[PDB]
RNA sequence: GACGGUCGAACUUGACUAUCUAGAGGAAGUAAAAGUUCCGUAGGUGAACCUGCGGAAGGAUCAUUAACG
RNA sequence: GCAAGACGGACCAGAGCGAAAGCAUUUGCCAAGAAUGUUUUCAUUAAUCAAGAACGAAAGUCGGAGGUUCGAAGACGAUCAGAUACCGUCGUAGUUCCGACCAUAAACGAUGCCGACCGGCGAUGCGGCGGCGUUAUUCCCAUGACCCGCCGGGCAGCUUCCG
């Protein structure tokens, strides 16, 4: 059975190659990345909602 | 040590300049009419001093009605119409004081309650709340004076019956006049003495 | 003008359980009050376990009362599952917290060594 | 220097390492000593 | 005669309310805290600043013709303790002392018949 | 405060780490200097750092008379508050109260260190280790693992110091991963997150939380305003999340039970339809 | 709460919610002196056009003129020596 | 869109010309001031342990108390 | 003044009920039960029990409905005394209900069941019997409250001989 978890192996790492690959262009814009609320805030309740626009500074 | 909010505090000028007092009467119900004063805005335009000045409740203890009658019984007062510096109020409920209500429950006896809601002739809907307590005898030697579930029972179903055979034969003028010596709760004391007597029985 | 409010609080002491030369002080000086809490408000307790709290504020023979009676100067009295408390308002204080400590499970011994600290270190205690 | 304020959260360590990765991606005189 | 108004007494775990109203209670006379008075967190709830409080509402009325006052004492209550602290004491003797005429007074801590959880949790609180 | 006593322990753990001769050796909380001196007959260079000032005259006074003495350089304070100096690895009986920052001080730290050896609580380092399908697998093992290689050596009793804890103690080597996974940062932490709130739900059932619906509802509006996507009026964001947890085949998963490469897997399901945690 | 420059902007005058107004010098980051006029919050500090005078403004309803009497000082201590 | 005319700020490059400030030094003169024990279960990233819910004592009880001129 | 969700203080007792876990607002309905009373009936139909089956606090899992209060987790604000040692604000899952699971507790008298035998003394809850006297009274509803003696089965005590 040790040599088929060897085999086994090579598809994990074949497979983590193209996934990683995948997941880079459905990436979101930098502007978009701000907007989003984060999921660390959760626990405050309906609180984190209150802010209205906060990414309103930005260097060029 | 805070700086606080730039402004944030207005010079306050005195209300009581705008403001007027005026009596507030009791119902003939009672021997004593002025039972104090009260005070209201004037009417600046749109807005009535009589509309605010309506619908206010008074708690006025029995004393300051009656010569002579108890002080831990109290009755509210709600103000119905103006007539010119005289507020004329009418019944609106009655209750007993907090310190009356905990000196009444002892440990080692029962307690009954029961409501009822009735419709008096003259159309006024009221929800009466009565309670009493066993009593122990004269020559007992056991502790405790405890009434059997069907004994409580056969209390509280007297217990309403007599309540509402007194309020819907009768209109509110004359249940208020029984209310003043409670006439209602020392019937019932009487009823239930054949069950298991009673005492400290009161609405 | 004061006559008449200093005996109806020197009459409640005693209806509390107060000793009469006890709540003579409420006349002879002015700034005594009295404090009064359940032991089912700093925690929940039932059955035996209630009974085990009583028994840890008294102690053995009250000493457990009368230890923390004398270092507050204050007097307290055990009704029930109501404590009362006549003192002066720092006085209170240090003994509603030591009372509090032994409800929640400390034993006398840890609760000795606190309140001689307490009273140690403060220099004005009137 | 006030530089534990990553190390609050873990979301504050992501920000952090973050921007780390960025700067890692785009990346006396003679005068005074001579004369 | 006296003319006759009615106090709410409000004493808080760090606080004191002194509050003066009509009859009907619908009107505010005057109303002073215990933070009013003292520049500090620590002495907000302490009997000295109550009794302050109790001075200026008391001499408040004196200007508008009241003479008499009802009192009601409160508490917390809910969840809470249910009695009134050593601030509200300290009030009702300073009202007495400014010659303010004393009515009927009277406890109207709100009593639960029955309540949800208190915070705590099991192990208890005030340690 | 605790010393650890047994000589044979220090040896052993002096002997895990590699400790080259021109390595620089940084050492948190030397305490009597048991460990430190025999770190400073084999090191370059040993950086101690103390918080507490007494321990420092006392260390200096150890090393003093002895050749090593020159090597030995002293920092007292708090590390965490500061830069690291540059070491090529680390040995320290840590403090227990701040064994997590500093763990995630070090694999902060570029440039990158060999290896470091480390002493922690046994319950703390068990979750540090623990693989998925274990019961102490948690979100500290996922963040540590993905970003280093950890590894357990040795156990250690409540004899071996004085005065006795009540908990027992292990030693655990923590190796960093040159370069970092290319991912990004803000939505792992964002999806780790939501499936250990409860780490042995389904996802299913971690998803259906009106708490989590709600703040990805918004996420998604915010999402669509921006590359002007018409939303339609009878839209359900529950009904959205399930159809993308069936085609990742991911529903009836337990998060106790996932490893790195299922979250990529999620990651990417998730943000294909648009859903962006961050 | 207010900071003005001074002195062709080498000395800083502040004013703080205590109701003190202190003089500093950007240099040797000392305070020359402090001013004890006011009991509340400086909410207003203006100074003129010449370095002469300053004007301050408090919570307390008062507001106070001041005058730069250093050349005046220095005149006093030297008269003695 | 095109031309003239008029008043023209603001820019670009050489050449003169006024002040203010930067650090590191060098050679002097004054002065003597100053600084509780556990059970079951569910979690944890300032874990030498903590927390949520429900149990146990295998944990130190003082004082008043029928009615009532 | 209006709405929503939980909760059933004081009376509440070492009292009562249930196989145990457990059980407290009024009124109505449905089925069940202990003890007592019996000059009713059957006539041994019984005891203990591997296998097998029903139930089983709290926490927890799955699918629905809701969400006041409290609240593991998480984010913020602080972190004095000190062997003196775990706060504050917001508050995720949960805590509530309807269905399926899960089958564990210091789930204690740290103590199998059935039967027989083996000391006194009073109280207490229910049922029955007898009674000098007090106290209410019965259209219906109801025939009770206290005191004394006795008999059963319970919940608990004070004292003890032999063993
Ligand atoms: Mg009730
Ligand atoms: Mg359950
Ligand atoms: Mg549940
Ligand atoms: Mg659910
Ligand atoms: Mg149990
Ligand atoms: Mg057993
Ligand atoms: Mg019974
Ligand atoms: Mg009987």
């Known amino acids: 059975k040790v040599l088929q978890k060897i085999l086994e192996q ?18 979101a814009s930098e502007a978009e990345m701000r907007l989003f609320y984060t999921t660390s805030k959760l626990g405050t309740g309906n609180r984190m909602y209150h802010t209205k626009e906060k990414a309103d500074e930005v260097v060029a | 040590t805070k700086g606080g909010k730039k402004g944030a505090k207005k010079k306050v000028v005195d209300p009581f300049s705008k403001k007027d007092w005026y009596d507030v009467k ?38 300051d009605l009656q010569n002579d009658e108890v002080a831990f019984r109290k009755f509210k007062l709600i103000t119905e119409d103006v007539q010119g510096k005289n507020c004329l109020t009418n019944f609106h409920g009655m209750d007993l004081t907090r310190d009356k209500m905990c000196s009444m429950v002892k440990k080692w006896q029962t307690m009954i309650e029961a409501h009822v809601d009735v419709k008096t002739t003259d159309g006024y809907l009221l929800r009466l709340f009565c309670v009493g307590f066993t009593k122990k005898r004269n020559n007992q030697i056991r502790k405790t004076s405890y009434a059997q579930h069907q004994q409580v029972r056969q209390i509280r179903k007297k217990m309403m019956e007599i309540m509402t055979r007194e309020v819907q034969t009768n209109d509110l003028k004359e249940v208020v006049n029984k209310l003043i010596p409670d006439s209602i709760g020392k019937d019932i004391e009487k009823a239930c003495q054949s069950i298991y007597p009673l005492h400290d029985v009161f609405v | 003008v004061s006559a008449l409010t200093k005996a109806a609080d020197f009459v409640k002491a005693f209806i509390l359980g107060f000793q009469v030369e006890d709540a003579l002080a409420l006349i002879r000086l002015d700034d005594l009050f009295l404090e009064s809490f359940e032991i089912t408000d700093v925690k929940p307790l039932k059955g035996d376990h209630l009974s085990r709290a009583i028994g840890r504020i008294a102690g053995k023979g009250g000493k ?56 140690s270190r403060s220099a004005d205690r009137f | 220097e006030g530089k534990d304020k990553a190390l609050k959260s873990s979301q504050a360590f992501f920000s952090k390492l973050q921007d780390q990765v960025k700067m890692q991606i785009n990346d006396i005189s003679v005068h005074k000593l001579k004369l | 005669e006296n003319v006759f108004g009615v106090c709410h007494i409000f004493a808080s775990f760090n606080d004191t309310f002194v509050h ?101 949790g099991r192990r208890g609180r005030r340690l | ?138 979100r500290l093992s996922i963040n540590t693992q993905l970003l280093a290689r950890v590894d357990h050596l040795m156990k250690v009793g409540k004899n071996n110091f004085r005065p006795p804890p009540k908990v027992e103690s292990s030693v655990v080597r ?35 939380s009106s708490a989590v619906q709600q703040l990805l509802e918004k996420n998604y509006r915010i999402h669509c305003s921006v590359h002007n996507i ?40 998730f943000n294909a339809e648009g859903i962006h945690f961050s | 709460l207010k900071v003005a420059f001074v002195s062709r902007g080498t000395q800083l005058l502040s004013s703080g919610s205590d109701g003190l107004v202190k003089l500093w010098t950007i240099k040797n980051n000392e305070c020359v002196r402090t001013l004890d006029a006011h009991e509340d919050k ?13 004007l301050t403004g408090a919570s307390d309803s008062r507001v106070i003129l001041w005058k730069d009497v250093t050349e005046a000082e220095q005149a006093e201590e030297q008269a003695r020596q």
């Not at chain 3, 917290?97 to 009273?119: D, E, F, H, M």
């Open chain 6, 1 to 138: 405060q605790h010393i650890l006593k047994n000589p044979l322990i220090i040896n052993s753990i002096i002997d895990k780490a590699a400790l080259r001769p021109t390595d620089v050796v940084l050492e948190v909380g030397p305490g009597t200097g048991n460990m430190t001196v025999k770190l400073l007959e084999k090191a370059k260079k040993v950086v101690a750092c103390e918080l507490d000032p007494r321990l420092v005259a006392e260390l200096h006074k150890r090393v003093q008379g002895t050749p090593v003495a020159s090597k030995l350089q002293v920092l007292v304070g708090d590390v965490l508050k500061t830069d690291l100096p540059f070491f090529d690895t680390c040995v320290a009986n840590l403090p227990y109260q701040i064994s997590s920052p500093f763990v995630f001080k070090l694999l902060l730290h570029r440039p990158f260190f060999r290896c470091a050896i480390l002493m922690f609580q046994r319950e703390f380092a068990l979750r540090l280790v623990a693989k998925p399908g274990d019961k102490l697998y948690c």
């Open chain 5, 20 to 120: 003066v109203t009509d009859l009907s209670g619908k009107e505010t006379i005057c109303r002073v805290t215990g933070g009013m008075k003292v520049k500090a967190d620590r002495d907000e709830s302490s009997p000295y600043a109550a009794m302050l409080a109790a001075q200026d509402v008391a001499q408040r009325c004196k200007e508008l013709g009241i003479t008499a006052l009802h009192i009601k004492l409160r508490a917390t209550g809910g969840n809470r303790t249910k009695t009134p602290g050593p601030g509200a004491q300290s009030a009702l003797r300073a009202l007495a002392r400014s010659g303010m005429k004393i009515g009927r007074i009277e406890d109207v801590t709100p009593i639960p018949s029955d309540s949800t959880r208190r915070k705590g």
């Open chain 1, 10 to 27: 090579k598809e994990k790492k074949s497979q983590r190659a193209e996934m990683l690959q995948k997941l880079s262009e459905v990436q």
């Open chain 3, 64 to 119: 457990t009362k009368f230890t923390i009676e004398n270092v507050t100067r204050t007097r307290i009295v055990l009704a029930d599952v109501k404590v009362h408390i006549l003192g002066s308002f720092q006085n209170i204080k240090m003994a509603r917290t030591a009372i509090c400590n032994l409800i929640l499970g400390n034993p006398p011994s840890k609760v000795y060594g606190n309140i001689r600290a307490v009273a």
């Open chain 2, 26 to 63: 009791a119902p003939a119900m009672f021997n004593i009419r002025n039972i104090g004063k009260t005070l209201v805005t004037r009417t600046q335009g749109t807005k009535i001093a009589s509309d605010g000045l309506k619908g206010r409740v008074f708690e006025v203890s029995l004393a």
């Open chain 7, 42 to 54: 400086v909410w207003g500090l203006h100074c003129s056009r010449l370095d002469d005078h300053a």
């Open chain 6, 230 to 269: 018409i939303i339609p009026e009878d839209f359900s964001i529950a009904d959205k999340i399930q159809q993308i947890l069936t085609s990742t085949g991911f529903s009836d998963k337990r998060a106790r039970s996932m490893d790195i490469d299922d979250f990529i897997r999620l990651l990417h399901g």
């Open chain 6, 174 to 208: 923590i190796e960093p991963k040159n370069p970092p996974p290319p991912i990004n940062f803000q939505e792992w932490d964002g999806l780790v997150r939501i499936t250990f709130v409860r780490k042995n739900k389904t996802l299913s059932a971690a998803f259906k």
